[PDB]
Homo-oligomer: A and B are copies of this chain.
Amino acid sequence: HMMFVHIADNHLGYRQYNLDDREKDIYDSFKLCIKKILEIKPDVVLHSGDLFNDLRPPVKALRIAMQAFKKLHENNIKVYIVAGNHEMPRRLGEESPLALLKDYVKILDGKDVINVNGEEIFICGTYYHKKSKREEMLDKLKNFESEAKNYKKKILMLHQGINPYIPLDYELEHFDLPKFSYYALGHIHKRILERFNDGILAYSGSTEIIYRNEYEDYKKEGKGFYLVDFSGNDLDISDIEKIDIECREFVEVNIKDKKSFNEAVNKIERCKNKPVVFGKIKREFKPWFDTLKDKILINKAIIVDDEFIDMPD
């Protein structure tokens, strides 16, 4: 009878390594998510911020985004979003890139209760606040619990880093946020879905690889978005599907001998499309490795000229 989608951090207009393809890659994954969300036809979409990677984004990005959310709004898919750190203006009167979406999307800085088919469910959220103004934020938070006391199904949307989930730096401690059904969170790039405070908390995570860091979280957790049904009285991990998204592949290498070299080539060969290769290569192998420059998108590996006696036990 009901379902909705949790997505965040598409980072529209990100140009990794100043490469054309990476900027395209970001766009493609975003669209790919959108194509599925239209296939899914959820009743609501929760967007946890950083839709755009910058405050004054590429024209191409706003184009893609505006056409995207328009397509959703035209299919009776309700959408909510909170401002990520990148979409929050710095000068007084500077407008958010999210402001270009006012006709397709509800920007949240308070409470709202959505009457869905066929029920009534509560949403609250607020834009990205800094560490500096946490006290400010707590007052906001206790007030959200207050207006949500008498609601069965209550959702919190935030774009902040929570203490256990991201060591440094965080703006919130896991004990700061009151009891809610679903914690639609954003700021963190890796998938985080686990039971929490008599309910269930999630970070949808970034929809493409933003750093050389998350290379294998896509391998083991996979990047994309969550699809929560929220039909029944309870919500558990069991009623949350993670929809994964194909994105630009990264193969790590550590070429130090004949084995590691061939292991590197083979990894690159089974790539569907030219991968970002990174890690380390011993000098002796680098000219040999330059033979794959056609099969590789961009090589971002450190060249080691030391001869190491490193031996495994």
Q: Which residues of A contact B (CB under 8 A)?
A: 20-21, 24, 28, 31-32, 34-36, 39-41, 55-60, 62-64, 66-68, 71, 83, 88-89, 91-97, 99-100, 102, 107, 109, 127, 132, 134-136, 138-139, 163-164, 168, 173-175, 231, 238, 241-244, 257-258, 261, 283-288, 290, 293, 303, 305-309, 311
Contact = CB atoms under 8 A, between A and B. Distances in A.
A213 to B, nearest CB: 20
Nearest to A310: B31
Given A24-B257, A67-B307, A67-B309, 12 more contacts: A32-B311, A36-B175, A55-B59, A56-B57, A59-B94, A60-B95, A60-B284, A60-B307, A89-B287, A92-B288, A93-B284, A107-B305
A97 B59 contact: yes
A64 B134 contact: no
A36 B135 CA distance: 17
* The 5 nearest A-B residue pairs measured at CB: A63-B307, A102-B305, A59-B95, A60-B95, A95-B284
Contacts of A241: 134, 173
A143 to B, nearest CB: 11
A82 to B, nearest CB: 11
A204 B288 CA distance: 28
A163 B284 CA distance: 29
A47 B20 CA distance: 31
A287 B175 CA distance: 24
Contact of A93 (B31, B60, B100, B138): B60
Contacts of A28: 311
Contact of A40 (B173, B261, B306): B173
A257 B107 contact: no
A36 B243 CA distance: 35
A261 B56 CA distance: 23
B243 A39 contact: no
Contacts of A36: 173, 175
Contacts of A97: 59
Contacts of A93: 20, 60, 257-258, 261, 284-285
Contacts of A174: 39
A107 B304 CA distance: 11
A272 to B, nearest CB: 11
A6 to B, nearest CB: 16
A67 B304 CA distance: 15
B283 A107 contact: yes
A59 B311 contact: no
Contact of A94 (B57, B60, B94): B60
Given A59-B100, A243-B173, A305-B99, A311 B94 contact: no
A60 B102 CA distance: 13
B20 A136 contact: no
Contacts of A95: 58-60, 63, 283-284, 307
